[PDB]
Amino acid sequence: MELCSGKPFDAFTDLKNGSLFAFRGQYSYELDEKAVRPGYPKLIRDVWGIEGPIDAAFTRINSQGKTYLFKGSQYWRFEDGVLDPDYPRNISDGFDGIPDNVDAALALPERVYFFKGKQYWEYQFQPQFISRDWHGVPGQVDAAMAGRISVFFFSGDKYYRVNLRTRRVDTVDPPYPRSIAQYWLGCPA
Numbered sequence: 235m236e237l238c239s240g241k242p243f244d245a246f247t248d249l250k251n252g253s254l255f256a257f258r259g260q261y262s263y264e265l266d267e268k269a270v271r272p273g274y275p276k277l278i279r280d281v282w283g284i285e286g287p288i289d290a291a292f293t294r295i296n297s298q299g300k301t302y303l304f305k306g307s308q309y310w311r312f313e314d315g316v317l318d319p320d321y322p323r324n325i326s327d328g329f330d331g332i333p334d335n336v337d338a339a340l341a342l343p344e345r346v347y348f349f350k351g352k353q354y355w356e357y358q359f360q361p362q363f364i365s366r367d368w369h370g371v372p373g374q375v376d377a378a379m380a381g382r383i384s385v386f387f388f389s390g391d392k393y394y395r396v397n398l399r400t401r402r403v404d405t406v407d408p409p410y411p412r413s414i415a416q417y418w419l420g421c422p423a
């Protein structure tokens with residue numbers, strides 16, 4: 235399935251060295267400005283060695299820059315695309331308090347947030363309401379990721395940008411929520 239199909243996304247890693255990965259169904263898209271074929275559809279099983287679909291993902295800011303992929307009750311930890319030894323692990327064992335079957339996750343420019351239904355959890359290396367602390371973000375999200383100064387929340391075929399300093403959905407034109415394909419990816423018309 236093409237990156238620019240306009241279908242919803244399942245998960246995104248965090249922006250690392252100008253690149254990230256999007257997940258949809260059985261597909262991994264590497265989003266990098268440098269790519270020869272940018273957003274070439276690769277199978278998750280071929281790139282990451284695990285079955286899709288994946289629930290959520292995040293990448294850590296630190297120099298190792300480990301990527302975490304979540305599916306059901308388990309998570310996998312990667313370095314330079316290689317699975318670390320003794321993964322997968324149980325979410326319950328690695329992330330005390332975090333539930334199974336998360337909707338989305340992001341790591342902040344060290345804090346990770348997990349999203350499930352109307353709630354989110356803060357994890358550092360007690361649930362709160364998304365719409366209370368993330369001003370403009372609706373209850374439930376499909377996926378999330380962190381940039382340098384903003385975070386992005388994905389819901390169906392649309393997304394929100396939240397400024398980190400104010401934790402408010404930014405005022406833009408046309409307003410959030412708006413098309414991922416058109417305004418986030420800059421897909422061809």
Ligand SMILES: [Ca+2]
Nearest residue numbers: 244289337376
């Ligand atoms: Ca998801």
Ligand SMILES: [Cl-]
Nearest residue numbers: 246291339378
């Ligand atoms: Cl995600």
Ligand SMILES: [Cl-]
Nearest residue numbers: 381382383384
């Ligand atoms: Cl940003």
Ligand code: NA
Nearest residue numbers: 246291339378
């Ligand atoms: Na994410």
